[PDB]
Amino acid sequence: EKKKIEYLDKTYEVTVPTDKIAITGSVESMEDAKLLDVHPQGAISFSGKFPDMFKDITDKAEPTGEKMEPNIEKILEMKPDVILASTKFPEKTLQKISTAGTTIPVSHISSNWKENMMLLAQLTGKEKKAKKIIADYEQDLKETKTKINDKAKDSKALVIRIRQGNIYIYPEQVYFNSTLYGDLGLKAPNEVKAAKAQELISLEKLSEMNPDHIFVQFSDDENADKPDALKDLEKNPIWKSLKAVKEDHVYVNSVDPLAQGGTAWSKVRFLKAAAEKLTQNKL
């Protein structure tokens, strides 16, 4: 018989505790697995390979495919007890994935970082480890707020992700923004308050926003269509006009560019990075 795992208003029947976990779409769950020492059966590949930072937990895994492109033939062959999917998949892709087994769309909304973590914990029987990781972050946070200067806290700060050579911004509770604005208390700017999903933003618009600090996240595996995007930007006269640029307050990949923002592991890293960068000295 199985157990009833409750996950964000929904309930799922899953035989737990299981090692037979297929992760597709949800890089969030990859990051949770990493801190929980969960070694899934299926894991997400990134350009066909498993990045160094995940190798400790991908040792018993085979690919479910690239992030946005689940391999149903592979996932069926695995016959998992649970498939951890993403809330970013179209519904028709979620229904198609669910032919291979019990499927839980894991939230990409960064304010659900605790629930996502506990879900994997509940599936794997590691609630103690998951509570300890969460508690530790909260202490890390309270301790880190004290180290961050007033000026920095009242500055205009942005997180951008460059994908296929375009600039994207995100809602207030998505990506790292829940840590930059929510946890550290910096004022989210209007364009971010207005964002309802991953939203394209022009350099032209950015130059009006004129942020004090810009965290730029850039992955080659997401920029194959234009690999010079970062260097071409830095040579654009509208980018060179930015306050953040001229004052040397642009931080490229302060956290690994495959980091998703809405996880314990993303939050702890961004919190330390933001702290180092905003206060201009290593903590």
Site residues, ligand ECA (CB under 6 A): 25, 67-68, 86, 88-90, 108, 163, 170, 174-175, 197-198, 222
Using the minimum distance from each CB to ligand ECA, give the nearer residue, 89 or 249.
89
Query: Least distance to ligand ECA from the beta carbon of 220, Å?
Result: 12
Q: Which is nearer to ligand ECA, 18 or 86 (CB)?
A: 86
Q: How far is the CB of 171 from ligand ECA (least distance, A)?
A: 8
Closer residue to ligand ECA in complex, CB, 63/242: 63
**Minimum CB distance to ligand ECA, residue 67 (Å):** 5
Based on CB atoms, which residue is closest to ligand ECA, 97 or 242?
Answer: 97
Give the shortest CB-261-to-ligand ECA separation in angstroms. Answer: 8
By Cβ distance, which residue is nearest to ligand ECA? 197
* Between 25 and 80, CB nearer to ligand ECA: 25
Q: List 41's β-bridge partners, or say none.
A: none
* Closest distance of CB 135 from ligand ECA, Å: 26
